[PDB]
């Protein structure tokens, strides 16, 4: 109940463009690994063969509002360089569809 509706910032190196940092809503899981949505692996350029990511915690009210409004992962779908979508099905989902 103290982690409810408190966003966190996730980041992977190298941060080549603006969508290398995104804000999510955390949930508690069993284990010692972070679970990441399949559709956000194109902006981060992440694969599951040994990668690691960093976690940051906003504190003040302005920081929380910025993380929840400006940097949320559900608001950034299009690429800021051409406008083409980034959170779209690929690999297995394309084969299924």
């Amino acid at each position: 109940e103290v982690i409810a509706e408190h966003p966190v910032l996730l980041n992977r190196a190298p941060t080549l463009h603006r969508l290398g940092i995104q804000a999510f809503e955390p949930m508690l899981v069993e284990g010692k690994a972070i679970q990441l949505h399949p559709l956000v692996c194109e902006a981060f350029n992440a694969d599951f063969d040994g990668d690691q990511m960093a976690v940051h915690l906003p504190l003040s009210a302005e920081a929380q509002a910025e993380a929840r409004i400006l940097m949320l992962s559900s608001n950034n779908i299009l690429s800021p360089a051409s406008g083409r979508p980034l959170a779209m099905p690929r690999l297995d989902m394309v084969t299924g569809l």
Binding site: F24, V29, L36, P38, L72
Partner: protein, 146 residues
């Protein structure tokens, strides 16, 4: 080219007597600390021995002058003091660098600011922060986009 300097020194109120020095400042002791090794010998601090060389050759020159030695000895001492001060400000600019233990050039005042490992590019444009962690990532095909 010459006026680019002469006009610079003419327009402002500064005087050209700032390139020849008569006193040298010393940094606060907390910015050049000394660290103990295994509770034994000290690990040196680079900056603290350049000042030592400066003070040594300054008290030598002062005593030689106060006693009244010939001109050649005081000229040699003044040359050595100038070289020591130059090594303090920027080590390796002219001549061979002043080395320490293991044949390693010492770190000067001017090396605290330049390069990828300098102050500007390592402690002012990027820092380490609290409330931060790290781990390995896996895939969960059950979460929503947020």
């Amino acid at each position: 080219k010459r006026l680019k300097v002469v006009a610079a020194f003419q327009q402002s109120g500064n005087s050209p007597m700032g390139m020849v020095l008569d006193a040298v400042p010393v940094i606060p002791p907390e910015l050049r600390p000394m660290v103990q090794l295994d509770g034994g010998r000290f690990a040196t601090s680079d900056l603290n021995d350049l000042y030592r060389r400066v003070i040594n050759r300054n008290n030598r020159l002062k005593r030689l002058i106060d006693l009244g030695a010939p001109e050649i000895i005081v000229n040699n001492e003044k040359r050595m003091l100038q070289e020591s001060v130059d090594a303090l400000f920027d080590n390796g600019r002219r001549g061979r660098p002043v080395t320490g233990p293991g044949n390693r050039p010492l770190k000067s005042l001017s090396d605290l600011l330049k390069g990828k490992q300098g102050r500007f590019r390592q402690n002012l444009l990027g820092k380490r922060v609290d409330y931060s962690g790290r781990s390995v990532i896996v895939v969960g095909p059950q979460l929503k986009l947020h």
